[PDB]
Amino acid sequence: MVDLKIDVSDDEEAEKIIREIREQWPKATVTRTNGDIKLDAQTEKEAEKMEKAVKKVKPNATIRKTGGSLEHHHHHH
User: Fold this and answer.
1) Which of 5, 37, 59, 60 has the most crowded CB, counting CB atoms within 10 A?
2) Domain locations along the chain
3) d(CA 64, CA 38)
4) Would you call 53 exposed, middle or buried from its count of C-beta atoms within 10 A (0-12, 13-18, 19+)?
């Protein structure tokens, strides 16, 4: 699981976040809340696609990405 919280400054784009996520991922918990979008990804790659689908509405989308994985630096280039 990857924590994805998408800031939303407008109502219509917030609608577009929900549609562009849930059309591919019906299981993706999208909690519509005036101010943000509370979203949960399954894996890191899944998050890469999810946050990208948001960026298909808004390229400079401020997305709060927490957790994902404890990327072990000895196993990291």
Assistant:
1) 37
2) 1-77
3) 10
4) buried
Residue 61 and residue 54: Cα distance in Å, rounded? 7
Query: Residue 16: CB partners within 8 Å, gap ≥ 6?
Result: 57
Residue of 34, 25, 28 whose CA lies nearest to 3? 28
Can you tell me whether residue 22 is helix, strand or coil?
Answer: helix
CA distance 43 to 14: 23
- The token duo for 29 is 């918990």
In the chain, helix, strand, coil percent, each to 5? 35, 25, 40
Q: Are 75 and 39 in contact (CB under 8 A)?
A: no
**CA 49, CA 57: separation in Å to the nearest integer?**
13
Method: NMR
